[PDB]
């Protein structure tokens, strides 16, 4: 009974309806590719490894995990039906960080920064 991580969110589901839309293509090519290069992106580039980071309570509190590594794979795999489903995953990722941690925490400042930028970039999407 060592701590383990849960399986990650799925990034493939052949039975799920999906599309490659202009807006989804933009979410990959512009928005995620951008965010992924930010100085504060690194904690969010993969599922939280609660074993490595010694956070045995993380997955007790966070029951809908999400990260930008899972997002990237989903966009690459054309997993989504529309851009809104993708934007929802970004919001879950941010909101998870705010739930688990506290205002003022370094990890919270990082999320807040990425989130301001994500919002700036999706303010105008393709048609």
């Amino acid at each position: 009974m060592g701590s383990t991580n849960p399986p990650p969110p799925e990034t493939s589901n052949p039975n799920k309806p999906k599309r490659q839309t202009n807006q989804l293509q933009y979410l990959l090519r512009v928005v995620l590719k951008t965010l992924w290069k930010h100085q504060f992106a690194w904690p969010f580039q993969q599922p939280v490894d609660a074993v490595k980071l010694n956070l045995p309570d993380y997955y007790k509190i966070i029951k809908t995990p999400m990260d930008m590594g899972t997002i990237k794979k989903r966009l690459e795999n054309n997993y989504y039906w529309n851009a809104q489903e993708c934007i929802q995953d970004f919001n879950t990722m941010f909101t998870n960080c705010y739930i688990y941690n506290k205002p003022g925490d370094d990890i919270v400042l990082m999320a807040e920064a990425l989130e301001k930028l994500f919002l700036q970039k999706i303010n105008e999407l393709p048609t």
């Binding site: 980071l53 010694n54 956070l55 045995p56 309570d57 993380y58 688990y100 941690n101 003022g104 925490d105 370094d106 990890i107």
Partner: peptide, 7 residues
């Protein structure tokens, strides 16, 4: 657990 020291 926490990700950092309490500020």
């Amino acid at each position: 657990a926490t990700k950092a020291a309490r500020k």
